Design a protein around this ligand. Structure first.
Ligand SMILES: [Zn+2]
Ligand SMILES: [Zn+2]
Ligand SMILES: [Zn+2]
Length: 178
């Protein structure tokens, strides 16, 4: 097994996957690492199992169809994984905790959003469809773009949103287009 957390790349109190070599801090894994369960399989293993049980699940899909899916256990897991993939980028630190807005020439967003809030919402099963989760995620980056205007700090929103969007397309097998 790895000696660093797969998500934050730091050592510490790590839990090890029994079916692959990754390791996780307790609250870096999503959902949080489960109390008992030997063997334990991490979210990367559980996602790979889904694909292996249903190979045709990798054929291309339309985004509009994916967004209307109900949050049944397999969609729930996919959204948790996608969230996790965003936390794996170090620039997600800018979007993890609750922001505040006091900048000359800008007004704060009407509906603030941040990654820990989405994490909690997922955990408390507050999304009924994929669309709910995806809307909140995109809201994070949109609010950032709008608030930071022409400051070059806006680019952080672009970069982290690109990580989201690529992983979204991969995890939900969205039909490739030009
Ligand atoms: Zn970690
Ligand atoms: Zn694993
Ligand atoms: Zn099948």
């Amino acid at each position: 097994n790895s000696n660093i957390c797969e998500v934050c790349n730091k050592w510490g109190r790590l839990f090890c996957c029994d079916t692959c070599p990754r390791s996780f801090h307790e609250h870096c894994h999503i959902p949080s690492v489960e109390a008992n369960k030997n063997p334990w399989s991490c979210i990367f293993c559980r996602i790979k199992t889904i694909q292996e049980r249903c190979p045709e699940s990798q054929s291309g899909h339309q985004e509009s169809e994916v967004l209307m899916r109900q949050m049944l256990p397999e969609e729930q897991l996919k959204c948790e994984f996608l969230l996790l993939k965003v936390y794996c980028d170090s620039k997600s630190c800018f979007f993890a905790s609750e922001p505040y807005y006091n900048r000359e020439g800008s007004q704060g967003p009407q509906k603030p959003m941040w990654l820990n809030k989405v994490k909690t919402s997922l955990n408390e099963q507050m999304y009924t469809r994929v669309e709910g989760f995806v809307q909140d995620m995109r809201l994070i980056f949109h609010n950032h773009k709008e608030f930071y205007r022409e400051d070059k700090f806006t680019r952080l929103g672009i970069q982290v949103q690109d990580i989201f969007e690529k992983n979204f397309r991969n995890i939900f097998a969205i039909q490739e287009t030009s």
